[PDB]
Amino acid sequence: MIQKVITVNGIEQNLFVDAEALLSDVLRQQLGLTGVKVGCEQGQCGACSVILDGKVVRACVTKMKRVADGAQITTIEGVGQPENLHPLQKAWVLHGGAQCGFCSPGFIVSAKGLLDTNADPSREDVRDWFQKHRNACRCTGYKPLVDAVMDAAAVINGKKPETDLEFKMPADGRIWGSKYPRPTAVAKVTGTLDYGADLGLKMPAGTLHLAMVQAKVSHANIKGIDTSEALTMPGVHSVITHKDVKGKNRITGLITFPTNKGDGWDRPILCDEKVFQYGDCIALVCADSEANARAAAEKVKVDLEELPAYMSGPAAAAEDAIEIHPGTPNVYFEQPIVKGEDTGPIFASADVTVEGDFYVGRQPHMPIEPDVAFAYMGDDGKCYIHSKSIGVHLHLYMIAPGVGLEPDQLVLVANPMGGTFGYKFSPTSEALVAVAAMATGRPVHLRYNYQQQQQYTGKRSPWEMNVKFAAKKDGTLLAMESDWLVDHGPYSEFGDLLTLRGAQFIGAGYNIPNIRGLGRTVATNHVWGSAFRGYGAPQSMFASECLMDMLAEKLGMDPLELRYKNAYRPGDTNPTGQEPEVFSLPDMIDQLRPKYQAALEKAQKESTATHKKGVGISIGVYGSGLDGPDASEAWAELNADGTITVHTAWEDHGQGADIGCVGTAHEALRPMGVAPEKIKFTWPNTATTPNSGPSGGSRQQVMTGNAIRVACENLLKACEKPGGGYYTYDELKAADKPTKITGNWTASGATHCDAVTGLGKPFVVYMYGVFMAEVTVDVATGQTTVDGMTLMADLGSLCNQLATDGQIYGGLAQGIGLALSEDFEDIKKHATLVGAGFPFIKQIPDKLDIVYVNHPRPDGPFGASGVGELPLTSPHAAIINAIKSATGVRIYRLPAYPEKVLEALKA
Ligand code: PCD
Ligand code: FES
Ligand code: FES
Ligand SMILES: [Ca+2]
Ligand SMILES: [Cl-]
Ligand SMILES: [Cl-]
Ligand SMILES: [Cl-]
Ligand SMILES: [Cl-]
Ligand SMILES: [Cl-]
Ligand SMILES: [Cl-]
Ligand SMILES: [Cl-]
Ligand SMILES: [Cl-]
Ligand SMILES: [Li+]
Ligand SMILES: [Mg+2]
Ligand SMILES: [Mg+2]
Ligand SMILES: [Mg+2]
Ligand SMILES: [Mg+2]
Ligand SMILES: [Mg+2]
User: Fold this and answer.
1) Which of 24, 94, 363, 473 is deepest in the core (most CB within 10 A)?
2) Taking phi first (over 0 means left), then psi (-120 to 50 degrees means alpha), and beta for anything else, what does residue 634 get?
3) Residues β-bridged to residue 238
């Protein structure tokens, strides 16, 4: 051990440390500076950036031996605090740079390091800096972060007053549609929002820290578990196995389709009989610290009989394949799509037909914050779980029978969280921590490291797809055929539903009167499927939007014009036979056309012998809602102090549940003149907030936004005074009148898609968009650079433009990853950010352009649709279409790795 006297955030610190200790651990654990965020722990993400003697370093890979006596360290806490914000922090808030906020302290500290060395950076200087220092963001697409740095720099340089970094209430007084900052932004930019790992450090000494004993093979029969050595190791309390589980030890898929061949009870909480995928949790070590738990978990011996594993859908789907879940076929679900007339005769007589085989793979969510959760037994005797769940009510019912609790004896709460992008539509750690809390009676905390986040949370499910179009010479689509095989890994939750998305979205965007198709779901031993932003559309629409360009090519038609010819117009129906609710695609295409033409001209002019530029188009469509008559509930409450609390379970991945609540309520409450700062939101809690439903399917703004709107309208009525005006809280209480008022809303016009035909009206609101990608391909290496992305977006009406711009930029960036670099195919190689192709700032162009072409929705609150998943529906199709434009190469199977492109170029 050594004494080091240094200065941290301007304060002399008398430090006692191990010279080998990591600075991240010292700062977080010994000094309580939890504003230093730790994600990857491998120097790849920049979340733990601190300034050490004028240099920006990653604390997670900086040992204390590298910190000299007299050193100066600055963390986010030293940059600024609430009510004492640094210009960088103010700028972050104003520009909406904090979505989940997990990367915000690291970017801001890093940016201070930049500005301290280069006071007047160009935008490229800022990008170069964040690339060098590995500052990674999965939410924002980087552009808002650069905007914030530039604005802060201008203030620090005296070019504009610092007061310009403070939001100014718009001239029309409308918060709805504005850039009003989100309520949680100040906490995020000051490092004072506690995420699950932060909370773990601030839990009492009585807390047990868990480590998972995980399968190191993909498929096995389990014969036994020996915990003897582990029990003798430092700090170990106990080891938990399936024997300690008080319920069914199975998670239920809950809404398993009737024609699913499996009962939906296939997923264990702690594996008992079998390993179904690499990483499966077989036991939990409980110890005094994460480090001690992990060390002991390594010593738990599992006796396995390894079985042949099926590591892809086609492998598991073979007729003679062995059943992974004995008694259920590996292909456990099929969904037909049967619209209009038989397609065979139509293809036979059509002027033109095209077909393609496409593949979209096992995209990893890669939030900067790895999964984390904790649980404890309350004094009320209930089991409380706090996690990254984005569907707290959903998860309560998925896990209660398995852990052995009645629904009222378990409470799920959503912690502030550093992104999920859908992986948290699935239970991950909730049942594990519940079982451990129940078994020990003690608080328990479980933090995954980044390899566990990659290997042992769910993934986008790969689809193998074949799609065909028949059309007239003039480009009019006549018919479509489709086939898709969904590799869902071993756990069935929502796999059938995902497969149905193929019937809804393959070919979406166009009038196609005749469709015959079939989707199939297959269990495999690769990672289980969890929702990933777009949930079936990125697969479906990659196939159909690439196929549209192939059809255009075969017709000798421009691919934007082919889309214009076919795009939804009044009288048309979508693939499930439903009339679209608005018709904005022709408008969007017309507005994009001259930009597309100019982009083509630029690509021709600026191409060189080795660097070929191209421009690609695609359409995206997705529903806002869960299928059928989805519904939500909110409570609007007038508090004693005149503030209003809007109670919902709108789960915040980081997308902006807070501002969605405040902005929607503010608009609804305008007749009573309620200032936005007087409107409070509630964090999701199954015991104390209404069942607003999960934040999946880009549904909350529509469903919960409507519920909030209704609740507020109902509160206005409750407050209305005879003769005009409004009662105060005191007046209402004196009259014994209610002050907490419920609102409900249902998408009553929706119907579930039919099990035989796939036809129905599954969503009452959809999101519509048109993408344009501009790329350069180095034809010597096959490397593609995306130089620009444009999204024409119809969101109906914006609740908040900082929120929606950010959603779109974030989605476009994930599209670039999906197109060019991302996968989770190799269990070890893809278990790091860099290994799996995470897009760092230089991979995302500074030119991310949005054009809102909003057509108010009949059923949306104030006309709004959702936004969340729109920008990931098909940006990767536009990108691949752009590579084709540039070079003549079509990549059918994502991602377009450089060697893959190069092989195609040279074929
Ligand atoms: N018009 C409009 C719309 C919308 N908005 C906004 O925006 C946001 C979103 O919304 P939406 O669309 O409704 O959604 P939500 O439901 O809330 O959420 C969810 C989503 O969200 C997204 N985004 C995001 N972001 C972030 N940052 N992070 C994350 O993680 C995430 N995730 C993702 C996903 S995946 Mo799934 O679960 O797969 O189905 S689905 C999803 C919010 O804040 C709101 O309010 C506005 O403003 N306006
Ligand atoms: S770089 Fe330190 S936590 Fe990722
Ligand atoms: S705001 Fe950057 S990772 Fe979420
Ligand atoms: Ca201890
Ligand atoms: Cl030492
Ligand atoms: Cl700028
Ligand atoms: Cl504004
Ligand atoms: Cl069914
Ligand atoms: Cl047919
Ligand atoms: Cl014709
Ligand atoms: Cl290919
Ligand atoms: Cl490569
Ligand atoms: Li919810
Ligand atoms: Mg100041
Ligand atoms: Mg027609
Ligand atoms: Mg025109
Ligand atoms: Mg490979
Ligand atoms: Mg090769």
Assistant:
1) 363
2) beta
3) 286
- The owner of tokens 């309350």 is 378
Residues 6+ apart with CB under 8 A from 657: 648, 650, 651, 681, 695, 700
Smallest Cα–Cα separation from 819: which of 602, 621, 423, 541? 541
Give the type of residue at 372. Answer: V
Amino acid at 840: F
Q: H or E stretch including 621? A: strand 611-623
Beta-strand pair 383-387/410-414 = parallel
Please name the residue that has the structure tokens 């982009």.
Answer: 599
Tokens of 505: 């979205």
Annotation: binding site for Mo-molybdopterin cytosine dinucleotide: 653, 869
Annotated binding site: 40, 45, 48, 60, 100, 103, 137, 139, 653, 869
Beta bridge partners of 58: 49
Phi, psi (5° rounding) for residue 649? -105, 40
Which residues are CB-neighbours of 178 under 8 A, at least 6 positions away? 170, 663, 800, 801
Paired tokens of 28: 């977080």
Helix (H, G, I), strand (E, B) or coil at 111: helix
CB 215 within 8 A of CB 278: yes
Q: Which CATH number fits domain 75-193: 1.10.260.40, 1.10.150.120, 1.20.1050.10, 1.10.287.110?
A: 1.10.150.120
Tell me the CA–centroid distance for residue 590 and ligand 16, in Å. Answer: 6
From the CA of 112, the nearest ligand is: 14
Of 85, 108, 100, nearest to 182 by C-alpha is 100
User: Which of these, 845, 863, 337, lies nearest to 582 by C-alpha position?
Assistant: 863
Instruction: Measure the CA–CA gap between 806 and 707, rounded to whole angstroms.
Output: 24
Q: In what order do the strands lie in the sheet with 514-522?
A: 331-339, 514-522, 477-487, 463-471, 352-360
Q: How far apart are CA 327 and CA 733, in angstroms?
A: 62
Task: Indicate the SS3 state at residue 368.
Answer: coil
* Residue 907 to residue 421: CA distance in whole angstroms: 37
Q: Give yes or no for residue 698 CB within 6 A of ligand 1.
A: yes
Q: Which residues contact 1 (CB under 8 A, 6 or more apart)?
A: 16, 17, 18
CB of 43 closer than 6 A to ligand 2?
yes
CATH fold label, 625-750: Aldehyde Oxidoreductase; domain 4 (3.30.365)
Q: Does domain 365-457 have CATH number 3.10.105.10?
A: no
Entry field: residues in the chain: 907
C-alpha span between 66 and 790 (Å, rounded): 45
Tell me the longest C-alpha to C-alpha distance in the chain: 85
Q: Which CATH number fits domain 581-624+751-907: 3.30.300.230, 3.20.20.80, 3.90.25.10, 3.30.365.10?
A: 3.30.365.10
Q: How far is the CA of 50 from the centre of ligand 5 (A)?
A: 22
Phi and psi (nearest 5°) for 56?
-85, 115
Catalytic residues, by residue number, are 869
Q: What's the CA gap between 441 and 437, in Å, rounded?
A: 5
CB of 189 closer than 6 angstroms to any ligand 3 atom = no
Amino acid at 203: M
Experimental approach: X-ray
475 CA to centre of own chain: 36
Quote helix, strand, coil % in the chain, to nearest 5.
35, 25, 45
CATH assignment of 331-364+458-580?
3.30.365.10
Q: Name the closest ligand to CA 479.
A: 9
List, in order, residues 6 or more apart from 211 with CB less than 8 Å away.
284, 285, 287, 290, 293, 294, 296, 297, 446
Nearest CA to ligand 2 atom 1: 43
**Which residue ranges make up each domain of the chain?**
1-74, 75-193, 208-308, 331-364+458-580, 365-457, 581-624+751-907, 625-750
